[PDB]
């Protein structure tokens, strides 16, 4: 099972970026997709997730009102729409499978086996 991220991008502060991930080998609607970013010097930061079936979402408080996640069922593709980008947001963004599966007591968690390559988004003046 593989995930494929879009390429890297460079933005100015007060900007927006659209990052996509394509999934293959495992039916898209059977699992949650989580987004995480790697910010060198800080380790990893969890951002949020999308259900992919019901498109329910959950985000960290520091992204409220700024990040929207969506999905296209017909292409088994997930998108990260992030607005009002700051230099603070320079990081490598990844999609990573989420948990074991939707129909499981702890299904949204404990797994994260598939991942992508990641996509660096640089924000700089």
């Amino acid at each position: 099972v593989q995930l494929l991220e879009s390429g890297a991008e460079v933005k100015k502060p007060g900007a927006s970026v659209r990052v996509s991930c394509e999934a293959s080998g495992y039916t898209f609607t059977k699992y949650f997709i989580h987004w995480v970013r790697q910010a060198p010097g800080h380790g990893l930061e969890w951002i949020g997730w999308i259900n992919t079936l019901t498109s329910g979402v959950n985000y960290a408080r520091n992204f409220q009102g700024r990040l929207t996640l969506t999905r296209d069922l017909s292409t088994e593709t997930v998108y990260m729409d992030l607005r009002n980008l700051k230099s603070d947001d320079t990081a490598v963004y990844y999609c990573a499978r989420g948990g074991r599966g939707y129909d499981e007591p702890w299904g949204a968690y404990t797994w994260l086996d598939p991942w992508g390559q990641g996509s660096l988004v640089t924000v700089s003046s």
């Binding site: 609607t29 949650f32 997730w49 999308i50 259900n51 079936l53 019901t54 498109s55 329910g56 979402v57 959950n58 960290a60 408080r61 520091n62 929207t68 996640l69 969506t70 999905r71 069922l73 017909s74 948990g99 007591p105 702890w106 299904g107 949204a108 968690y109």
Partner: protein
């Protein structure tokens, strides 16, 4: 000595296809079921216990598969709308809520083109100037629902086949998992009405004594919390915008029906909820959540779902498909009338499948709809920066997984197989 006893009162958990029993067009009003209802009274099983798990209940899985299958069987032979996939020339006839589109259609007569027009909700069209095209034209096949088919759900009772029985929890305060102490056996479930909705559960059953909250797990915030109310709330929904139908000869021996005209002024669909009944209901829900989380503070917020069926409340009134704005409802904090505008759409990606798109017909504009709120689907939001200002827990509307609508009614039932034959030691022979 080993002897044989037949008619032994034992069973094992098992699954089997259940029978559809009706109360007395009408596919969800069971035109294809039988009213097998000879006063099927229950027997109480005395001093037995049984393990129930509503989250692993195959009866829910059957409702899902059966309703989808029946839906498709009923609409399979209806008119394809492929001939309408042309660039449309559209104007603003709120700010253009309804578009007036004209187009070149070439299918009823192979060597001719006709000019046709239709009035329809902007929510179903893609801007491409006055150039537009229908939103669900590409990637999916759209069929118009048949004018002689209706989906007006009635309570449906599911019955075990001979050799099987349905066990039921009669326990109060049953949380959906673990053992039940008061267990009875019924041949058939009570009638459960196959109502389709998202954020709020409509026209279902009520809790016997108090608002109760069930979840597979309460620390896993990825789970949907099912809230069952012990009192109904009645909602008055209407679309007073009067209209008339235009019949378009789309394909040979095939007719398409669209809105031909708007009669009177422009009005939008709206729903009326008692202000007080709603805020008192939330107080009760919040109370139960406070018990679950040892106080903290309960707050209600917006769905933030992205996807319109999730974002807005998805509501079905005959052939009228509503997307109601509920941000006026889920806006409160609990630390101890209201009119919702509704959007109307005619293309439905029913069951969230690509290729199953359906087009609702006109219903001559005017409609009155009156429904009962019996429960809610909510999701938990918290855990971010737990170290500081973490005393409040937020709940938001949740929905879209149809199996929750059925789970919320079928949670008290289990199917078992009767195994009447067995042996035991004796002195005989």
């Amino acid at each position: 000595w080993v002897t044989v006893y037949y008619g032994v009162p034992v069973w094992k958990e098992a699954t089997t296809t259940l029978f559809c029993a009706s109360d007395a067009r009408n596919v969800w009003a069971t035109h294809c079921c039988v009213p097998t209802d000879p006063n099927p009274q229950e027997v109480v099983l005395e001093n037995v216990t049984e393990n129930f798990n509503m989250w692993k209940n195959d009866m829910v899985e059957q409702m899902h598969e059966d309703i989808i299958s029946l839906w498709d069987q009923s609409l399979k032979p209806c008119v394809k709308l492929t001939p309408l996939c042309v660039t449309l020339n559209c104007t603003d006839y709120e700010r253009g809520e309804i578009k007036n589109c004209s187009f070149n259609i070439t299918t009823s007569i192979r060597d001719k083109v006709q000019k046709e027009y239709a009035l329809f909700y902007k929510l179903d069209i893609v801007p491409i100037n006055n150039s537009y095209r229908l939103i669900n034209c590409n990637t999916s096949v759209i069929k118009q629902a048949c004018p002689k088919v209706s989906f007006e759900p009635i309570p449906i009772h599911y019955c075990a086949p001979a050799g099987f029985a349905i066990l039921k929890c009669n326990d109060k305060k049953f949380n959906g998992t673990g053992p039940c102490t008061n267990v009875s056996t019924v041949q058939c479930t009570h009638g459960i009405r196959p109502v389709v909705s998202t954020q709020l559960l409509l026209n279902g059953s009520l809790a016997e004594k108090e608002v109760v909250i069930r979840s597979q797990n309460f620390t896993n915030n990825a789970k949907v919390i099912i809230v069952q109310l012990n009192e109904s709330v009645v909602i008055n929904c209407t679309r007073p915008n009067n209209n008339t139908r235009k019949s378009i000869h789309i394909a040979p021996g095939r007719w398409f029906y669209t809105t031909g005209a708007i009669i009177g002024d422009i009005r939008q669909a709206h729903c009326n909820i008692s202000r007080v009944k709603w805020n008192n209901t939330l107080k009760q829900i919040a109370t139960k959540l406070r018990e679950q989380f040892k106080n903290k503070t309960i707050a209600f917020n917006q769905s933030s779902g992205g996807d319109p069926e999730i974002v807005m409340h998805s509501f079905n009134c005959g052939g009228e498909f509503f997307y109601c704005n509920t941000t006026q409802l889920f806006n409160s904090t609990w630390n101890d009338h209201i009119t919702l505008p509704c959007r109307i759409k005619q293309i439905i990606n029913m069951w969230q499948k690509v290729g199953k798109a359906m087009y609702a017909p006109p219903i001559r504009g005017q409609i009155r709809c009156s429904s009962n709120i019996t429960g809610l689907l909510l999701t938990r939001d918290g855990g971010s920066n737990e170290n500081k200002t973490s005393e409040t827990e937020t709940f938001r509307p949740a929905g879209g997984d149809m199996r929750d609508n059925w789970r919320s009614e079928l949670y008290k039932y289990k199917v078992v197989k009767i195994e009447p034959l067995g042996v035991a030691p004796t002195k005989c022979k």
